[PDB]
Write a protein that binds this ligand. Structure first.
Ligand SMILES: [Zn+2]
Lengths: 539, 98, 50, 128
DNA sequence: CCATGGAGTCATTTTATCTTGTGTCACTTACAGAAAAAGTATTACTAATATATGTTGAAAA
DNA sequence: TTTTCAACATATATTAGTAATACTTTTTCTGAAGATAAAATGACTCCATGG
């Protein structure tokens, strides 16, 4: 019926769907459909692909596979069973194509390092750098700068140079680095039950906890090995100053893009509940401490290991106090009052830190002006969701959905009491909500076994399902919006390549601005939705 | 269609949570009632076009595909035939074999 | 359709059909339970068979 | 109260006072007029509205009877749910500064859809 | 250091359950009440007509 | 005693106008045996302390 329906393209593709359009909208061709198989069908082996895609065996698979790997679009492992030989298993890389999915706000990450050089081709320079770096995947300043012209100013060219370090940009990607975290927890969970020097036969507990402990502490430096090591930072060659190790291949570490994009959201939450001035103080206050907060890195092994009715807590509370403690000494006791506009006498203007009270910050060593951190984010994140259904379901929806938050599993009779309106409204702004999930239902039978009109109903939250009703936001228009970008490319499909290789006509000029402002809208959307989506996937 | 568009016009403005889930339930009982036998009358009571006469043969569905000769057994593997004939018999020995 | 009155036509039951199987008569069986009774054309789409 | 309307009739009034209770009065003219750092040391102002409401409700200018401390608390609970204002330390209450709501981004207000021609839009339905 | 007590998991019965049961003709015959709305039946008038109806009664046999 | 008259009267129907009341409707409007399982049974064992 009319095909403008747009159901096939719509409903039946969750999760996986985003990827195989992204790569399709990005790499495309055969290079895409492989990942579509790879996500959907799980871990997969080189030969086994060809039994399905019909992709001309060991041709596309190999070529497109490495075509992904330098862009790290796959998770990569190889090993052998006890029989012998060897085999390779794969996955869809991490968040992976995610790197592509932003790439614009990764362009915006200039603004942080943008300081000390403003309104320059130096801007355009480092932009050209990064937009070449992600596109080309792994880079080396030796091969890149080598391809870059000679007879210019080396330490002036490199832009980053002494900057390559910062928090973001790049790190060596080393071997098992992008070997999947979950599985390297298994390989490292060897060596411990694997090596038990016949300690005692009794108490597998002494075998167990020690293993996990050994598994934890040995894992610690594993992610910290790439985190920072001076092999990059320290080197200072002859006739020069401190250099990186351009001998090494590096790739953008998205964790400090996680942190960076996120701290902006922590702002826009704070830029509400305080005054714009002290807000700005909070705005730069993160810039110093936005380094060491694990943030989207802290979940880490929260994936891959069975949780516990206890040990899961001993994992939580560990993340609660940790860096608020040791990096707490890296965190803000007395700031430099870095730049600031406020002016004249600037010090008590700084004492305003206490003006932040609820619902975040506002904890310290007793009376040095300071903020909690590793515990902050947990007591911060949980309350980052804010209004996710405002100007979508109507404001009336908030008040009771907010009310359902305070108490729990509450019945509409007393919802009609605490909250208030003619029931004629509740049965809309509530019932209309439940279709979008959130509230769900509790129900209990009364004076019946279980029946139709023989019981009472209660309403609850289950914020998991709530906080999960917005992962449709992934499948939502990040589904459609990206099509919009693609399926319109066919309007000028013959005109596009004409306009690219031409640099005329009335109708050519006619729809240029049309399709273009069109685009700039579709990516404006993508930026907005992206900014919202920045929350629910982690933190 | 009826008990649906009820809930469709319902849940938009009027009705209520307790006067909803028994409808949507009743929907569940029709649509499953539709394709199989199972539930008959666990004191659920009927909808449109009943009269309240306690009529047991309520289905022309899963049964038409299932047992006896509805279809599967009798009307498909057992197809009634064409170009045929039936009659009583009488001997004719002056006629050969075959 | 069933019986006399209505019209005619007769019955190869699940019980009886086996008989012609035992003989191993293919073209007869297919000539019976197919052409003689309901001979019908269907247009199926190779892709996504329906 | 009673079970029918003219609830918000007084709500919009009490909100206006509770606003004045937080920082000084409205002060929206140019970029930053509010609070000038809340007088001196915003921390040194520790303030509720609570009981005082009843004394303010004495103003009347409306057809009703008086009202109990209890029901007032619910009146404030609604504006906790609407997040017009904030519940702190029992009967103490603040405002969410969403008086600015009166008047990339997050703020459903000050925003308007296109909603004609072009088919690429973000609804909250058509996945459902 | 080891026998103990206590529990946690894991075979093992025994109870609660559902699908069947030779074939072919040849006829056969959604609860009820509540409220709102719409509309109407008296409720007076002349005013002519012409049956019905009752009673009664008066008048005649 | 009875019968025929008569006769008296009163509805019965139309068309109005009111006007007001009362009164029914209607129309919303909701309060037969042999697999499968579930659980009670029980043994096993990790793991507890203590002489
Ligand atoms: Zn087809």
């Amino acid at each position: 019926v009319m095909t403008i329906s747009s159901l096939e393209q719509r409903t039946l593709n969750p999760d996986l769907f985003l990827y195989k359009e992204l790569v399709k909208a990005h790499l495309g061709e055969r290079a895409a459909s492989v990942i579509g198989m790879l996500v959907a069908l799980g871990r997969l082996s080189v030969r086994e692909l060809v039994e399905k895609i019909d992709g001309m065996d060991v041709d596309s698979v190999k070529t497109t596979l490495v075509s992904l790997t330098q862009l790290r679009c796959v998770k990569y492992l190889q090993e052998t069973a006890i029989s012998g030989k060897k085999t390779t298993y794969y996955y869809y890389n991490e968040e992976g194509i995610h790197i592509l999915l932003y790439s614009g706000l990764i362009i915006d990450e200039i603004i942080t390092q943008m300081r000390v050089n403003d309104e320059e081709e130096h801007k355009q320079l480092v932009a050209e750098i990064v937009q070449n770096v992600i596109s080309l995947g792994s880079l080396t300043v030796e091969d890149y700068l080598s391809s870059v012209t000679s007879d210019s100013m080396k330490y002036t060219i490199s832009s980053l140079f002494v900057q390559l370090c910062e928090m973001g940009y790049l790190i060596q990607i080393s071997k098992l680095h992008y070997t999947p975290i979950e599985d390297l927890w298994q390989f490292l969970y060897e060596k411990h039950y694997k090596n038990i020097p016949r300690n005692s036969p009794l108490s597998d507990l002494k075998k167990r906890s020690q293993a996990k402990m050994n598994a934890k502490t040995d894992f610690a430096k594993i992610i910290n090995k790439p985190n920072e090591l001076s092999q990059i930072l320290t080197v200072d060659p002859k006739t020069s100053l401190r250099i990186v190790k351009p001998t090494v291949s590096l790739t953008i570490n998205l964790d400090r893009f996680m942190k960076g994009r996120r701290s902006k959201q922590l702002i826009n939450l704070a830029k509400t509940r305080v005054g714009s001035v002290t807000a700005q103080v909070y705005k730069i206050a993160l810039r110093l401490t936005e380094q060491k907060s694990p943030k989207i890195r802290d979940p880490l092994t929260q994936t891959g290991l069975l949780q516990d009715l206890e040990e899961a807590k001993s994992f939580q509370d560990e993340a609660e106090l940790v860096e608020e403690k040791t990096p707490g000494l890296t965190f803000n006791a007395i700031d430099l009052a870095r730049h600031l506009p406020s002016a004249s006498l600037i010090n008590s203007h700084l004492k305003i830190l206490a003006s932040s009270n609820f619902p975040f910050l506002n904890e310290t060593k007793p009376g040095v002006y300071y903020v909690p951190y590793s515990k902050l984010m947990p007591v911060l994140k949980s309350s980052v969701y804010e209004y996710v259904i405002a100007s979508t379901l109507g404001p009336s929806a908030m008040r009771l959905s907010r009310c359902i938050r305070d108490n729990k599993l509450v019945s509409e009779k007393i919802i009609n009491s605490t909250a208030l309106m003619k029931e004629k409204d509740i049965r809309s702004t509530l019932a209309s909500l439940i279709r979008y999930n959130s509230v769900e239902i509790q129900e209990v039978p009364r004076t019946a076994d279980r029946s139709a009109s023989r019981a009472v109903f209660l309403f609850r939250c289950k914020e998991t399902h709530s906080y999960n009703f917005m992962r449709q936001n992934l499948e939502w228009n990040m589904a459609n919006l990206l099509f919009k970008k693609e399926k319109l490319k066919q309007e000028n499909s013959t005109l596009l390549k004409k306009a690219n290789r031409d640099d005329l006509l009335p109708s050519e000029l006619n729809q240029l601005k049309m399709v273009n402002e069109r685009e700039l809208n579709v990516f404006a959307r993508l930026s907005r939705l992206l900014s919202l989506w920045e929350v629910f996937q982690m933190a | 269609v009826w008990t649906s568009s009820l809930i469709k016009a319902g849940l938009d403005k009027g009705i209520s949570i307790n006067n909803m889930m028994e409808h949507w339930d009743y929907l569940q009982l029709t649509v499953a009632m539709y394709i199989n036998s199972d539930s008959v009358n666990p004191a659920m009571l009927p909808g449109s076009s009943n009269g309240g006469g306690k009529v047991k043969p309520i289905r022309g569905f899963c049964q038409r595909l299932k047992g006896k000769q509805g279809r599967f057994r009798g009307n498909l593997s057992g197809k009634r035939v064409d170009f045929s004939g039936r009659t009583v018999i009488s001997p004719d020995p002056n006629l050969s074999i075959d | 359709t069933e019986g006399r009155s209505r019209d005619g036509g007769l019955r190869l039951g699940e019980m009886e059909r086996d008989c012609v199987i035992a003989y191993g008569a293919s073209q007869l069986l297919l000539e019976r339970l197919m052409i003689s009774s309901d001979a019908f054309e269907v247009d199926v789409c190779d892709k996504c068979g329906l | 109260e009673l079970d029918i309307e003219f609830i918000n009739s007084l709500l919009t009034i009490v909100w206006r006072f509770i606003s004045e209770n937080t920082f000084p009065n409205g002060f929206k003219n140019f970029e930053n007029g509010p609070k000038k750092n809340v007088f001196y040391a915003p921390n040194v102002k520790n303030y509720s509205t609570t009981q005082e409401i009843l004394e303010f409700i004495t103003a009347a200018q409306v057809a009703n009877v008086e009202l109990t401390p209890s029901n007032i608390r619910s009146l404030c609970e609604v504006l906790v749910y609407d997040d017009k204002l904030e519940k702190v330390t029992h009967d103490c209450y603040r405002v969410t500064l969403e008086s600015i709501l009166q008047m990339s981004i997050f703020n459903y207000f000050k925003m308007f859809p296109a909603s004609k021609h072009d088919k690429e839009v973000v609804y909250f339905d058509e996945w459902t």
